Design a protein around this ligand. Structure first.
Ligand SMILES: *[C@@H]1O[C@H](CO)[C@@H](O[C@@H]2O[C@H](CO)[C@@H](O[C@@H]3O[C@H](CO[C@H]4O[C@H](CO)[C@@H](O)[C@H](O)[C@@H]4O)[C@@H](O)[C@H](O[C@H]4O[C@H](CO)[C@@H](O)[C@H](O)[C@@H]4O)[C@@H]3O)[C@H](O)[C@H]2NC(C)=O)[C@H](O)[C@H]1NC(C)=O
Ligand SMILES: *[C@@H]1O[C@H](CO)[C@@H](O[C@@H]2O[C@H](CO)[C@@H](O[C@@H]3O[C@H](CO[C@H]4O[C@H](CO)[C@@H](O)[C@H](O)[C@@H]4O)[C@@H](O)[C@H](O[C@H]4O[C@H](CO)[C@@H](O)[C@H](O)[C@@H]4O)[C@@H]3O)[C@H](O)[C@H]2NC(C)=O)[C@H](O)[C@H]1NC(C)=O
Ligand SMILES: *[C@@H]1O[C@H](CO)[C@@H](O[C@@H]2O[C@H](CO)[C@@H](O[C@@H]3O[C@H](CO[C@H]4O[C@H](CO)[C@@H](O)[C@H](O)[C@@H]4O)[C@@H](O)[C@H](O[C@H]4O[C@H](CO)[C@@H](O)[C@H](O)[C@@H]4O)[C@@H]3O)[C@H](O)[C@H]2NC(C)=O)[C@H](O)[C@H]1NC(C)=O
Ligand SMILES: *[C@@H]1O[C@H](CO[C@H]2O[C@@H](C)[C@@H](O)[C@@H](O)[C@@H]2O)[C@@H](O[C@@H]2O[C@H](CO)[C@@H](O[C@@H]3O[C@H](CO)[C@@H](O)[C@H](O)[C@@H]3O)[C@H](O)[C@H]2NC(C)=O)[C@H](O)[C@H]1NC(C)=O
Ligand SMILES: CC(=O)N[C@@H]1[C@@H](O)[C@H](O[C@@H]2O[C@H](CO)[C@H](O)[C@H](O[C@]3(C(=O)O)C[C@H](O)[C@@H](NC(C)=O)[C@H]([C@H](O)[C@H](O)CO)O3)[C@H]2O)[C@@H](CO)O[C@H]1O
Ligand SMILES: CC(=O)N[C@@H]1[C@@H](O)[C@H](O[C@@H]2O[C@H](CO)[C@H](O)[C@H](O[C@]3(C(=O)O)C[C@H](O)[C@@H](NC(C)=O)[C@H]([C@H](O)[C@H](O)CO)O3)[C@H]2O)[C@@H](CO)O[C@H]1O
Ligand SMILES: *[C@@H]1O[C@H](CO)[C@@H](O[C@@H]2O[C@H](CO)[C@@H](O[C@@H]3O[C@H](CO)[C@@H](O)[C@H](O)[C@@H]3O)[C@H](O)[C@H]2NC(C)=O)[C@H](O)[C@H]1NC(C)=O
Ligand SMILES: *[C@@H]1O[C@H](CO[C@H]2O[C@@H](C)[C@@H](O)[C@@H](O)[C@@H]2O)[C@@H](O[C@@H]2O[C@H](CO)[C@@H](O)[C@H](O)[C@H]2NC(C)=O)[C@H](O)[C@H]1NC(C)=O
Ligand SMILES: *[C@@H]1O[C@H](CO)[C@@H](O[C@@H]2O[C@H](CO)[C@@H](O)[C@H](O)[C@H]2NC(C)=O)[C@H](O)[C@H]1NC(C)=O
Ligand SMILES: *[C@@H]1O[C@H](CO)[C@@H](O[C@@H]2O[C@H](CO)[C@@H](O)[C@H](O)[C@H]2NC(C)=O)[C@H](O)[C@H]1NC(C)=O
Ligand SMILES: *[C@@H]1O[C@H](CO[C@H]2O[C@@H](C)[C@@H](O)[C@@H](O)[C@@H]2O)[C@@H](O)[C@H](O)[C@H]1NC(C)=O
Ligand SMILES: CC(=O)N[C@@H]1[C@@H](O)[C@H](O)[C@@H](CO)O[C@H]1O
Ligand SMILES: *[C@@H]1O[C@H](CO)[C@@H](O)[C@H](O)[C@H]1NC(C)=O
Ligand SMILES: *[C@@H]1O[C@H](CO)[C@@H](O)[C@H](O)[C@H]1NC(C)=O
Ligand SMILES: *[C@@H]1O[C@H](CO)[C@@H](O)[C@H](O)[C@H]1NC(C)=O
Ligand SMILES: *[C@@H]1O[C@H](CO)[C@@H](O)[C@H](O)[C@H]1NC(C)=O
Ligand SMILES: C[C@@H]1O[C@@H](O)[C@@H](O)[C@H](O)[C@@H]1O
Lengths: 325, 172, 319, 171, 172, 325
């Protein structure tokens, strides 16, 4: 101009944008890094370190698995008639009953957890010519030898084990789930002395499905006083369908059925403790905040959760580019 | 910027301005002053406010899924379970990265535009009474009290009233 | 005034606009938009693709030769339509890997059968049951052959059947499961059965299961079905001393582009190149929210029931 | 609009105009008039018309796939089959939601750009014979009949002919 | 493009300009000449060079995966393994298609804007000493040698010293 | 109007660079549009041969992975080998006793991912039975033989006593035992080799078990044999134990294979292997891993671009091209 004192009859009018002192770097299509006024984190990296029980109905398995609790293990009798949204399995859990294996244990674990209930109902299975309630020292309940509370170990009555045959029609409007099994003796003498016949057989069958499993007499590892085993199976009887159980030996009979539902429940393996709080997302690392759209805590989740990603941080700009003075 | 307003012909922003994103700093007979522009500020906030909701819905509720962790080595059916999960994670990881890049890219594009929009909006009112000096500033060639600054700010600037005084001061 | 002239620029706009969504805004009005998510026709169009209506038969019953599914002999298709009111009306049967077979047959897209000269020395052929009535009389699956004793003898059957063709043969056989020991020693003489169907590259052996099953169309016995594929230059062999539900021939397998679908809607003449359980749908749009189950040139299924694309500028009506 | 033309300095759109997306209105010695700009209109239509075919291909054939609905309860294998499809649906549902917003965002901006360019094109032609009145209107400071307007529309306006006339009335 | 610079108000490009992307052409008492601009060029190259690295991960290793080729018919287990791979490929095929279309669109817009930004930068320097001819050209209305031209290209052109000379040329 | 440019005037024009020979790309706005430059993002061409200077490639030649594992006479060169990628040729074949493997693919995957055929012998005591049984269908050198890793057990004198042995895992890694059962051609051949009519094999750990019954019947002659064998495997983890009970038909193991959580795999190809530099491999030879996508094969190993359906994708590395005149 220069005129150190500006004139009365003219004016100046400048335009501009705001700014902050300490900005933050984001990534765009154009730039690798670029400073903005404020940004926000989209990836939940921090867990709460515990499971919140006030949102969804949680159930702690303690030292019992979902299958042990279902089967009816002596030290899992507290779990009778329980329903849940999320069952929790601990790493230190175990079995202290008769040693067993379940062909396709994973599929059975999936079906029970999804239904989300252990609602058992006993039924009047009329067994003819056999001794009910078999007991074992490997499975102790109280001050006596016992067995799985939802299973029935059938053995010979006198000097004869006749061919069993029983009916049980499903007259309800829901799916019944029967859990049954078969025994595997350690020697030929056990087989012959226990169930008379040299070879047992268990033909469970409906109008459409059938299952026949033959025993296999042989030595297995010593497990709580037993070198024998018991295999477990299941058959889902549909509304109107009829259950039939034919066997001439080695039958571990079912006492009743489980009520199956198209549930919205599940099971999870986690070792963190459960505590009083509110959270709608649950991972093996505890519950997490479900406000962020993504998370880097765990791929395994249950409930209203954000989507898992390999990135640990994604800054979304919530403001303009910052240009300090 | 692509319009070249922010970090361009505007050398820098102002840390002094705290009641808005865009505004005016002026100097006249009555003195200096400042005033934020609420219309251009709000337009930028309206768009930026929760701009992930327009593509990703808050969060989905999910229940029983497949097993993503195993203890025993099994083979075929296990391999497929692993492969399915990685492909999902890989595809979502890509989507998240691409999303933020475009959102961030767009966030800078719109704010840069607003600064440029307000600049042109002002220039049109001023007509031939002022000149773009450079640095995002206008030299107004007539007397302009705070009442006359408000008239530019609220859109009711009547350039015809000052045109005689303005044109005369420009060409001398 | 004559000394000056005014020239104004602008753009067009309409009275009734339409709302669309962008990255910037939730709902913004534009001059014109269009829908990108596909309603069904309520019927499966059988002009473009070859459609086959099962009516009261499944794909397996039509394959095995169930009395009320003999209309489906020597049929080929692009899409086999199974009705929910389907049923079996022959001998009660089960099939290990039922769904796997259903897919292989549906994928092939044909029930071409060719009877082969099987010699069965010392056994009664063409066994029949009252559960499987063909013309108000006892009968059996038309593609299977129930063999039983002849006289007081059931000898160890042993036959062979080479593939001297240039394509994969599909054999469908089974094994009878009797209800009691009396049926076993009456029908098949022996106390226990055995069936060994094998090739140079595989083998399947199955023992019967003497046990009572639920009452189905008169019988408490069962039959288990098992399939076996024979490649070009390979050879089939069937050894058995009891309970063999023998095959009469083979089905031709080919890498078709066919499939099977469950649906309960009418089928009639119309023009469409996508098919769902709800019916045929128009494939003009890129997406659809009718059904995830599809077949043909079909739009992609998504969760959303509407996605409006803008095909015009922003709408700014006059005051 | 990011250029600030549509719903910006141009107050509103014209319902009266039919044969074009953008155009001119004017007044002069020979009364009022209206016209439409084909060149700018066609650029808008070309970009918009069938713009998904540069992203989503022509719908291809899909035959036998896998089971998506199940009457029975089977366990492990079924859970995977359901999970596989559930994963497919969400990823496509996202891509669809994403695409449409991007495509729409682009369609708003390209049309907003065309309006701005048409205004700049005219401004450059008039040189210093006219002035921005605001509302996308130009005040021409010389006698401009319909034949002179036509020259502005098809891009043959020679400002040097009306230089001395304009600059006299101007200042 | 959207700014209407490249293939817009500027008629065509220069094949002769090999030392840069953007530049100048001038004419005065001392003849004609052509000089590139390094600032606009560098800004464009930094945005384009390895632009896919900002969205795609540094290609990582994949080891044992599922089987994707079968010589027999197996059924339910095989159909799923084929379906998983088909579903995967179609999604990456789409992501690749959409990405390239967006990045190409971004390239055309950013380059078109850098053209427009250099023009508007020069217009603000010249103030009222020059007029826009159209065709992206400027008519300077005063004595302007190669030393004066050079001051515009590096950004130290003081319009005030020429102003009085230019205003008399423009309106008389 | 004056033709000569006055000394009190000057012209200044702004422009962009151009090129005579442009290239086409696709944007959101345009299907084809000419740009100053472009680059390809799809690697559609392979090198035509597999490289072995980055990853260790092992040519399988006439042997498959399983035929090299079991000890097929013409695969004896593959003993104590290790790899990152194993190449199985289509012309490969088996030349020993005819066999099958229930879930053949699953075992193939486990060993290929393990990436090693490191064998270790163990002292199994098969009291009261013959060992090293061999067939005419498996000629090692010019004499009868058998799979080197398997041991065929038959009767001694006139008895096949109930075999029962155990082998605990006191190491710090997983043991993989490859074992099997033999299927005769008739009842006559059954009692001839193994005395007892009903053969049986029980292989059991403390928590799992696999019981297999033989299969009898005439089958097609493969190298002069109607008899067949089925192969099974058992994973024994650190701390667990192995036990094998059987009264016939046992094709016993001689030792264990070492298992690893490796990064190895297996590939089907008929392309030669030679010296070169590449971090990506497909069934069509190695591929250049510079471009982000590829269009050679969906089966890939190593640091590879993502497979897509498109054979070409042009990215613009330059502005809009507009030639002169
Ligand atoms: C097939 O072959 C196998 C292997 O030879 C046999 O399996 C073994 O059978 C024997 C006899 O039943 C088992 O012997 C038992 O071992 C127990 C081990 O339990 C723990 O306790 C000891 C310390 O006491 C620890 O050192 C050890 O590590 C274990 O953690 C012992 O407890 C038993 O010893 C005695 O215990 C009580 C103490 O009150 C005494 O009263 C009894 O006399 C008892 O003998 C017992 O010796 C052995 O464990 C089995 N091994 C395996 C791997 O299972 C099969 O029996 C054989 N089958 C046939 C049909 O021949
Ligand atoms: C193992 O245990 C099971 C179950 O106890 C036994 O199986 C039953 O065996 C009996 C005798 O063979 C079967 O009896 C038959 O029942 C049929 C019922 O089905 C119908 O009922 C509904 C009514 O709700 C009708 O709508 C429908 O149309 C059917 O009619 C009857 O149809 C049969 O009728 C015949 O029986 C009478 C007997 O007085 C005869 O005089 C006539 O000929 C008449 O036609 C018949 O009563 C029964 O179905 C079997 N049930 C099941 C579930 O299998 C096994 O026998 C047993 N196994 C062994 C080895 O003992
Ligand atoms: C159930 O039915 C099946 C199939 O019919 C029987 O299996 C066949 O059994 C016979 C008798 O053991 C086998 O016969 C042998 O075939 C060998 C194969 O080599 C070639 O032979 C054929 C001849 O037509 C050639 O065309 C072709 O090139 C073959 O490669 C021959 O090597 C043998 O030939 C010789 O036989 C005598 C001994 O009998 C020797 O002394 C001679 O020197 C001569 O070399 C022999 O003929 C036949 O291979 C089996 N086929 C299959 C597919 O398994 C079952 O035996 C039967 N089961 C029961 C219980 O009856
Ligand atoms: C318009 O300009 C032309 C050429 O541009 C020159 O302008 C001069 C003023 C100066 O700025 C120079 O840098 C520019 O290139 C003028 O042509 C010039 O005329 C003068 C006078 O004749 C020459 O200067 C001297 O003349 C004699 C030559 O015998 C000698 O004493 C000196 O060495 C010197 O040459 C000059 O060289 C001319 N330049 C050219 C290229 O011909 C022109 O005069 C001017 N027009 C008007 C009306 O002033
Ligand atoms: C040191 C010694 O020699 N001791 C034996 C002692 O083992 C034996 O007792 C029986 O031994 C048999 C042999 O295996 C079983 O172990 C018996 O175990 C029980 C059990 O504890 O579970 C008893 C139980 O009553 C049985 N269950 C039922 C329903 O009957 C089971 C059952 O037999 C097994 O599950 C079959 O596999 O086993 C154990 O009592 C005695 C008997 O004479 O002799 C000592 O010398
Ligand atoms: C329980 C009783 O006393 N029932 C009598 C009985 O005389 C008869 O019922 C017969 O019971 C047998 C049991 O073995 C079969 O169920 C008979 O069914 C038939 C059939 O399908 O109709 C007869 C047929 O000839 C048989 N076919 C062949 C090839 O053998 C089949 C076949 O044995 C079974 O399907 C095998 O599972 O069974 C049935 O007639 C009835 C009628 O006279 O009268 C009762 O009083
Ligand atoms: C326009 O883009 C093209 C390709 O997109 C550029 O061509 C590239 O030119 C460079 C040299 O500038 C060449 O470099 C060579 O690279 C290969 C492979 O890395 C190497 O073997 C050679 O030793 C050399 O370094 C290269 O051939 C070529 N790119 C490709 C992929 O072939 C061109 O340079 C660009 N030009 C302009 C003006 O933008
Ligand atoms: C636009 O504002 C002007 C005046 O400017 C005002 O700016 C405000 C931010 C505030 O500081 C206020 O004090 C200041 O006056 C308004 O015009 C004036 O209105 C007054 C009302 O009393 C009249 O007395 C004046 O004559 C009048 N003159 C001028 C030259 O502006 C104007 O009303 C306002 N318009 C709108 C739409 O808000
Ligand atoms: C800048 O943005 C941050 C978030 O990026 C804001 O602070 C958060 O506000 C949310 C919602 O009110 C709260 O959960 C937390 O208090 C804050 N979280 C974090 C991680 O900071 C805030 O709007 C701005 N903060 C500053 C300092 O400018
Ligand atoms: C890459 O390798 C695969 C084999 O894994 C090739 O697939 C074959 O390609 C030929 C020629 O196109 C066809 O005739 C065959 O039918 C294909 N498959 C098989 C199983 O044979 C593929 O073509 C190879 N790519 C090349 C050579 O460019
Ligand atoms: C800016 O340029 C000023 C004058 O222009 C010169 O530009 C260069 C092209 C130079 O080599 C000479 O030929 C021109 O005369 C010069 O005075 C300043 O030094 C320059 N300033 C900066 C910061 O670059
Ligand atoms: C006035 C107008 O533009 N109408 C359009 C029409 O051209 C087109 O058929 C359709 C595209 O979906 O949308 C509507
Ligand atoms: C910015 O960060 C600095 C780091 O030293 C700190 O001193 C201060 O809190 C911040 N300054 C402002 C003005 O916010
Ligand atoms: C989360 O839990 C997993 C097991 O599911 C565990 O391996 C991991 O260490 C945990 N992550 C933490 C605590 O950050
Ligand atoms: C353009 O329009 C003007 C207006 O009258 C007219 O003179 C002329 O014919 C037109 N020129 C061209 C080249 O179209
Ligand atoms: C790599 O391949 C070459 C050529 O086949 C072969 O000679 C060599 O043994 C292989 N291995 C190494 C480590 O070079
Ligand atoms: C645009 C054209 O201009 C010239 C005249 O012939 C008419 O005005 C025509 O409309």
């Amino acid at each position: 101009s220069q005129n150190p004192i500006s004139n009365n009859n003219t004016a100046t009018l400048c335009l501009g944008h705001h700014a902050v002192a300490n900005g933050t770097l984001v990534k765009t299509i154009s730039d690798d890094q670029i400073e903005v006024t404020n940004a926000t984190e989209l990836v939940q990296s921090i867990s709460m370190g515990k499971i919140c029980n006030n949102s969804y109905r949680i159930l702690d398995g303690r030292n019992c698995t979902l299958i042990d609790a279902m089967l009816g293990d002596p030290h899992c009798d507290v779990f009778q008639y329980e329903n849940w949204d999320l069952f929790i399995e601990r790493s230190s859990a175990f079995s202290n009953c008769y040693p067993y294996d379940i062909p396709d244990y994973a599929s059975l674990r999936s079906i029970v957890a999804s239904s989300g209930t252990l609602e058992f109902t006993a039924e009047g299975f009329t067994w003819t010519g056999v001794t009910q309630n078999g007991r074992s020292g490997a499975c102790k309940r109280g001050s006596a030898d016992s067995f799985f509370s939802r299973l029935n170990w059938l053995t010979k009555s006198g000097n004869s084990y006749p061919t069993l045959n029983v009916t049980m029609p499903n007259n309800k409007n829901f799916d019944k789930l029967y859990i049954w099994g078969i025994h595997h003796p350690s020697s030929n003498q056990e087989q012959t002395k226990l169930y008379i016949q040299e070879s047992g057989r268990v033909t469970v069958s409906t109008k459409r499905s059938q299952q026949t499993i033959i025993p296999n007499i042989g030595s297995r590892p010593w497990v709580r006083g037993q070198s024998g085993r018991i295999s477990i199976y299941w058959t889902i009887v549909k509304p109107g369908d009829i259950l039939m159980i034919n066997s001439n030996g080695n039958l571990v009979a079912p006492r009743g059925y489980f009520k199956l539902k198209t549930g919205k429940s599940s099971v999870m393996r986690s070792d963190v403790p459960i505590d009083i709080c509110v959270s709608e997302c649950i991972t093996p690392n505890g519950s997490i905040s479900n406000e962020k759209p993504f998370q880097n805590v765990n791929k395994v989740t249950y409930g209203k959760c954000p989507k898992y990603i390999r990135q640990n941080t994604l800054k979304l700009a919530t403001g303009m580019r910052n240009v300090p003075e | 910027g692509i319009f070249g307003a922010i970090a361009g012909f505007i050398e820098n922003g102002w840390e002094g301005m705290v009641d808005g994103w865009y505004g005016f700093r002026y100097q006249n007979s009555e003195g200096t002053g400042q005033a934020a522009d609420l219309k251009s500020t709000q337009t930028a906030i309206d768009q930026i406010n929760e701009k992930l909701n327009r593509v990703i819905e808050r969060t989905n509720e999910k229940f029983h899924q497949i097993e993503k962790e195993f203890s025993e080595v099994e083979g075929r059916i296990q391999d497929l379970e692993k492969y399915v999960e990685d492909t999902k994670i890989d595809l979502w990881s890509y989507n998240a990265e691409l999303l933020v890049a475009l959102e961030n890219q767009h966030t800078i594009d719109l704010t840069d535009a607003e600064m440029n929009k307000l600049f042109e909006k002002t220039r049109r009112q001023l007509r031939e009474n002022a000149e773009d000096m450079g640095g995002g500033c206008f030299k107004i060639y007539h007397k302009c009290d705070n009442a006359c600054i408000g008239s530019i700010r609220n859109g009711t600037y009547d350039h015809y009233i000052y045109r005689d005084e303005a044109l005369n001061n420009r060409f001398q």
